[PDB]
């Protein structure tokens, strides 16, 4: 694997593992499972420690890069403003989850982390047939190159030491060797919400480097 991706065996707890992964890498990808409360809660609890570890930038799928100005206004108005701003595109995945996502963005912001958007508009119909489901995901993954360009631009705009990119885990598959396709090499995190396993290095597949054990809703 790319020597810039440093894979350290998880340091116990969920917070300790995430901070340790950011401490060991200039770029970490958090593979989101939309609707799962554990992931945004984890980021909220890690915000201050991540900042201290050198994380100055958090680039998120939930905001379109083109809406940066409007989002920064919401981020200052507070959690309630961020939720209303994200609802149009992201409320579909649950009120509680959208609330926790908003809390995580706010907690990162007030911890001194620059929060910016990576997403780009792209309309696709709901997939019903087997082939539509496949084409839909392939089309979505075509945005990786643009997600990466937006995350790069905004990291540089604030001279970030380390950055985290937070987006749908499907975009970070087959990332073991060189990180996500059409994106910069980085440590990719996935989540095991079965409550069985523990945080670990991923050996089942090459869709992430480490798996953080969490709780399902
Ligand atoms: Cl844009
Ligand atoms: Cl608040
Ligand atoms: Cl089609
Ligand atoms: Cl997706
Ligand atoms: K890559």
Automatic annotation (TrEMBL):
Organism superkingdom: Bacteria
InterPro entries hit by this protein: HopBA1 (IPR054303)
Gene3D superfamilies in the record: 3.40.50.11550
Protein name (record): Type III effector HopBA1
Organism listed in the record: Pseudomonas syringae pv. aptata
